[PDB]
Amino acid sequence: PESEWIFPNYDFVQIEDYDWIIDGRLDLVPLTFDAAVNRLGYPLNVVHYFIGFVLLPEDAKKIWADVDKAWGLALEAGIPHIYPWSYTQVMRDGVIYAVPKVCG
Protein backbone atom coordinates (compact mmCIF):
# COMPACT_ATOMS: atom_id res chain seq x y z
CA PRO A 1 0.00 0.00 0.00
CA GLU A 2 2.25 2.76 -1.31
CA SER A 3 -0.41 5.43 -0.77
CA GLU A 4 0.03 5.06 3.01
CA TRP A 5 3.84 4.73 3.24
CA ILE A 6 4.83 8.16 1.88
CA PHE A 7 7.46 10.28 3.66
CA PRO A 8 5.06 12.46 5.74
CA ASN A 9 3.62 9.31 7.37
CA TYR A 10 6.91 8.34 9.06
CA ASP A 11 9.89 10.10 10.61
CA PHE A 12 12.59 8.04 8.85
CA VAL A 13 12.97 4.97 6.65
CA GLN A 14 14.98 1.73 6.79
CA ILE A 15 15.69 -0.52 3.80
CA GLU A 16 17.53 -3.75 3.01
CA ASP A 17 18.97 -5.51 -0.04
CA TYR A 18 19.49 -9.06 1.23
CA ASP A 19 18.10 -10.74 -1.89
CA TRP A 20 20.25 -8.73 -4.32
CA ILE A 21 23.49 -9.45 -2.41
CA ILE A 22 23.14 -13.23 -1.98
CA ASP A 23 23.62 -13.36 -5.75
CA GLY A 24 26.15 -11.26 -7.63
CA ARG A 25 23.50 -8.65 -8.44
CA LEU A 26 25.52 -5.60 -7.44
CA ASP A 27 24.07 -3.62 -10.36
CA LEU A 28 20.68 -3.32 -8.62
CA VAL A 29 22.16 -1.94 -5.38
CA PRO A 30 22.02 1.76 -6.42
CA LEU A 31 18.31 1.36 -7.21
CA THR A 32 17.64 1.01 -3.47
CA PHE A 33 19.35 4.34 -2.78
CA ASP A 34 17.39 5.96 -5.62
CA ALA A 35 14.03 4.64 -4.39
CA ALA A 36 14.58 6.10 -0.91
CA VAL A 37 14.57 9.76 -1.99
CA ASN A 38 12.12 9.83 -4.92
CA ARG A 39 9.97 6.68 -4.86
CA LEU A 40 9.25 7.13 -1.14
CA GLY A 41 10.11 10.83 -0.80
CA TYR A 42 12.16 10.60 2.39
CA PRO A 43 15.17 12.96 2.52
CA LEU A 44 18.72 11.65 2.45
CA ASN A 45 19.54 12.51 6.08
CA VAL A 46 16.91 10.09 7.46
CA VAL A 47 17.86 6.98 5.45
CA HIS A 48 19.05 3.95 7.41
CA TYR A 49 20.51 1.03 5.46
CA PHE A 50 21.14 -2.61 6.34
CA ILE A 51 23.98 -4.00 4.24
CA GLY A 52 23.70 -7.76 3.89
CA PHE A 53 22.69 -11.17 5.18
CA VAL A 54 25.04 -14.16 5.46
CA LEU A 55 23.44 -17.01 7.45
CA LEU A 56 25.51 -20.04 6.44
CA PRO A 57 29.13 -19.91 7.67
CA GLU A 58 30.35 -21.63 4.49
CA ASP A 59 29.41 -18.54 2.44
CA ALA A 60 30.95 -16.00 4.84
CA LYS A 61 34.00 -15.01 2.78
CA LYS A 62 31.79 -15.10 -0.34
CA ILE A 63 28.85 -13.03 0.93
CA TRP A 64 30.98 -10.62 2.98
CA ALA A 65 33.04 -9.95 -0.15
CA ASP A 66 29.94 -8.49 -1.82
CA VAL A 67 29.02 -6.79 1.47
CA ASP A 68 32.03 -4.48 1.23
CA LYS A 69 31.16 -3.55 -2.36
CA ALA A 70 27.63 -2.57 -1.32
CA TRP A 71 29.07 -0.46 1.51
CA GLY A 72 31.15 1.55 -0.95
CA LEU A 73 28.05 2.32 -3.01
CA ALA A 74 26.25 3.40 0.17
CA LEU A 75 29.17 5.66 1.08
CA GLU A 76 29.07 7.04 -2.46
CA ALA A 77 25.30 7.48 -2.16
CA GLY A 78 25.79 9.48 1.04
CA ILE A 79 23.70 7.31 3.38
CA PRO A 80 24.10 8.84 6.86
CA HIS A 81 23.56 5.69 8.96
CA ILE A 82 24.60 2.20 7.82
CA TYR A 83 24.45 -0.93 9.97
CA PRO A 84 25.27 -4.60 9.49
CA TRP A 85 22.15 -6.71 9.79
CA SER A 86 23.14 -9.33 12.38
CA TYR A 87 25.28 -8.99 15.49
CA THR A 88 25.37 -12.80 15.69
CA GLN A 89 26.71 -13.20 12.14
CA VAL A 90 29.35 -10.51 12.72
CA MET A 91 30.73 -12.32 15.77
CA ARG A 92 30.28 -15.77 14.21
CA ASP A 93 32.36 -14.80 11.17
CA GLY A 94 34.61 -12.27 12.90
CA VAL A 95 34.55 -9.40 10.41
CA ILE A 96 36.95 -6.48 10.83
CA TYR A 97 37.61 -3.16 9.09
CA ALA A 98 41.22 -2.81 7.92
CA VAL A 99 42.94 -0.82 5.19
CA PRO A 100 43.70 -3.01 2.14
CA LYS A 101 47.38 -3.76 1.71
CA VAL A 102 49.27 -1.56 -0.76
CA CYS A 103 51.17 -4.64 -1.98
CA GLY A 104 48.52 -5.26 -4.63
Partner 1 sequence: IEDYLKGKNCLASPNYDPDDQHSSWREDLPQFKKDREHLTLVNTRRNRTYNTKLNRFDPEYWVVDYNALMVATIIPYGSKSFKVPCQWRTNKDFLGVRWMTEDTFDHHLYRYETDPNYL
Partner 2 sequence: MYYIEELFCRLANGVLNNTGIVTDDRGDIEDDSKPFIIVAANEALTRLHGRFNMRNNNVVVEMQEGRTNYPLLAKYAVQSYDPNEVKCPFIMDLAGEKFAEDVIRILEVYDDKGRRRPLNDRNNPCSLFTPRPNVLQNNAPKAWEVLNVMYQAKHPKLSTAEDGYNEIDIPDTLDPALDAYIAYRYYTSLNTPESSAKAAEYLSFYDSICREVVEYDLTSDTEVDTNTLFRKRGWR
101 scored as a contact of partner 2 (CB under 8 A): yes
Total residues at interface with partner 2 (CB under 8 A): 9
* Residues in contact with partner 2, shown as a per-residue x/- string from 64 to 93 under the rule CB under 8 A: ----xx--x---------------------
> What are the distances in angstroms from CA 4 to CA 21, 36, 43, 75?
28, 15, 17, 29
Q: Please choose, from the candidates 19, 20, 25, 17, the residue with its C-alpha nearest in 3D space to the C-alpha of residue 79.
A: 17
CB of 34 to partner 2, least distance (A): 21
Please report, as residue ranges, which positions from 9 to 68 form the binding site for partner 2 (by CB under 8 A): 61, 68
**Neighbouring residues of 78: CB distance < 8 A, sequence distance ≥ 6:** 44
Please report, as residue ranges, which positions from 34 to 93 form the binding site for partner 1 (by CB under 8 A): 60-61, 64, 67-68, 71-72, 75, 90-91, 93
94 scored as a contact of partner 2 (CB under 8 A): no
Burial-class residue 54 by CB neighbours within 10 Å (0-12, 13-18, 19+). buried
Pick 20 or 64: Cβ nearer partner 1: 64
